[PDB]
């Protein structure tokens, strides 16, 4: 006939789309089945053998795909040596390195993946220790923890070294493996957010009892959650953040299938000093709350401590507003210069933060209704300011990540760079502050003043996201890209 | 300096992206807050005034935006007349029609939106009748139902007549309104899927009791759900499907902001006859199960009835397989020729169908464990075949929607057109069959044979999606586009 009149099976675009679609559908089926299995209560108690087989199978297929990659794509050296020996005096195909430079994720994202994977492996090892010291747990728990640790470590190495992967080899096998890795990461994320939700009920009940005794008369489970205090909450949010990052990186790698300067610390001083002041204030607040039992029990102090949190969030929000106003002078990007991975992860962190704040606000009101509204509304104000701050900061981060300093005025004068530096430092301090807040109720709020000024006790919902880490990574990318010479 | 060195506030692309981002964030915040409010148990019981205010506010802002559109964009006639009178002898700006032809959604999608919106308005009117006959309900329920009906009717008209909307007018106002409409539609969808989940617990408990008595010794709530039997389930899935379609249409309209043949029934006979045979078999099965109490109580019959369902799903799956094999000869699309709206809705229906089937399989096993595995595994096989059929059909629909008949052989001979016609007819019959299945447990499974062959009783989970309607719409689009002369 004419050109482009061949069967779609021979068309590279059509068959690439078909493999893409098949792998995506397979992932979707696995993720839905994993969610159904995890929620189901008859799979953790009765069908323990089936649940163990599913767990071992998910991690084992992940490890098999990782081994296939390391042997046949990333490091085909030993395979080439074996194939040469076979040809020498055994039998009578060779692979090539073909190393690439497709760095999918940002360096900050991969470093965070390393840190969170290490913390998750620490959590897995702690479970393993608990199940070793326990007789209730059996040999299958040992295998589950070991295979989880092995998969997590191998995926840490794969994520960090995701540039030397040449996905154009074994395209369909790599697509299926990437989708299985996404399914495994999402299944781990769902497992550990269901585990995090178990502590929500206990915290809620404890809060209701503590509230009542002070205002009266006017299906996944990890043993460390309820054994190692509230540190297990930090470990579990670390592992869910690691799983989210890994799933995003694997999705970027899977999407790439089939598709053919120096630190400029200039104009980063006034913001850096303000960021250091923010860090010093946050650290002083954390230390005063932690080491001084007298301070955490007084009402003056608990008022001042809550005012400190409100001031921190208000200062961050005002910094974002001033940054938008100053950076209004910048220029839009001439062409794309980023991966949607960072935006997607930041939006997921934003969703988690808004959910956390809304649940806290709902619990706060609930509690105030049960006490005839005798509680100061400062915790509600802190929650609302936190939600407004995270929303405005997400908008600011996206807008300024799509901004550049192209004009001569925007080059000699850097509008907002001080604000960007301050926001990056303050986001690191808010990350460590939110880590501390997960252990604030470990001290014990025996202070009646804590029931009327401290807002952490009202946040019984789990914090499933590290929005501050993703915000810091995006802000560092903005700082190093938006204010660059080009 | 040079070109493209102006502030991003003046850059049309940058400010369009900024308005897009702000409206998307606003929608996200509203949807998260709506989900938190609906799940919260203290908003339906204690904070009834706050819940009513939120309900009325969401629907009222939707209606205000709709009125603004109808007055100032779609039908600016009366506004022009008023503005002319003002200029005549009152004061001393005119709007223009600027009607467009941007048909966002498919005709089948808009017709389904009309049908489902009508059914949802019927459900709202039934509630209104119940609350009128009830003294427990107060005047606020009247207002809630009335405003829901008004919003649903206006959005029906807006969705059907979404071509004459010129979104390029009042770009930012229309963006905010489209995002508020998406938030309202998602909030309605979440409300009614939470309502559908309430019947899940009752059905599960009833199934456990009925199973036990036959094998012993070897936060949203709608009053019609538990009052009008299982017809309320059909009405509620109709309203959730309408809300999903409306949200998708509004998203397409919002995405369009800022961006500057005859029926060929040839070669559609053998498939049409097979589709008619499929319809006749399905209707005979439905009638025999409905009108004959003797048949629905016998074991021979209940076995044969389940075998009929298995045969229907197996025939549909085999039709999809044969269609892929035959249409392998077709040609890939030269360029895009569809809106992601249909693909997104089909994938959501697929997710819902897989969730339904997986929950049914989980319940089936659970039940068999409680009876020492004395139940035939036919219901599990039916569920598995249904899930496989829907997955394979989704893959087939997407692949063949990205296919064309460009070669001369693919023109004179139409590969798969018979299969496409048969699949469309059989999907209409499976739609009516799944509608019937929602009323199959209304008869009452007093037949012990129903507890061992009929698989509907094990599907205690709600069917939240009309996957068959979306499949029929996509298949009709394929039939009218893939096998066209061009």
Numbering used by the authors:
A (entry chain A), B (entry chain B): 47 to 138, 145 to 270, 303 to 344, 358 to 583
Published text:
The otopetrin (OTOP) proteins were recently characterized as extracellular proton-activated proton channels. Several recent OTOP channel structures demonstrated that the channels form a dimer with each subunit adopting a double-barrel architecture. In this study, we performed structural and functional characterization of the Caenorhabditis elegans OTOP8 (CeOTOP8) and mouse OTOP2 (mOTOP2) and illuminated a set of conformational changes related to the proton-conducting process in OTOP. Combining the structural information from both channels, we propose a working model describing the multi-step conformational changes during the proton conducting process.
The WT CeOTOP8 was overexpressed in HEK293F cells and purified in glyco-diosgenin (GDN) detergent. Its structures were determined at pH 5.0 and 8.0 using single-particle cryo-EM. At high pH, the CeOTOP8 inter-barrel interface adopts an intriguing structure. The Glu325 side chain points down towards the intracellular side whereas the His567 imidazole ring adopts two alternative conformations. The His567 side chain flips up toward the extracellular side in its major conformation, forming a salt bridge with Glu325. This structure likely represents a transient state in which the protonated Glu325 is transferring its proton to His567. In its minor conformation, the His567 side chain remains downward-facing in the cavity and exposed to the cytosolic solution. Firstly, TM12 of CeOTOP8 forms a bent helix at low pH with a kink at a highly conserved proline (Pro559) residue, whereas the N-terminal part of the TM12 helix before Pro559 unwinds to a loop at high pH. This helix-to-loop structural transition allows the Phe563 side chain to rotate upward, vacating the space necessary to accommodate the upward flip of the His567 imidazole as well as the downward rotation of Glu325 side chain. Thus, this structural transition appears to be prerequisite for the formation of the proton-transferring bridge between Glu325 and His567. The other structural change is that the residues 244–270 after the C-terminus of TM5 are disordered at low pH but form a helix that extends seamlessly after TM5 at high pH.
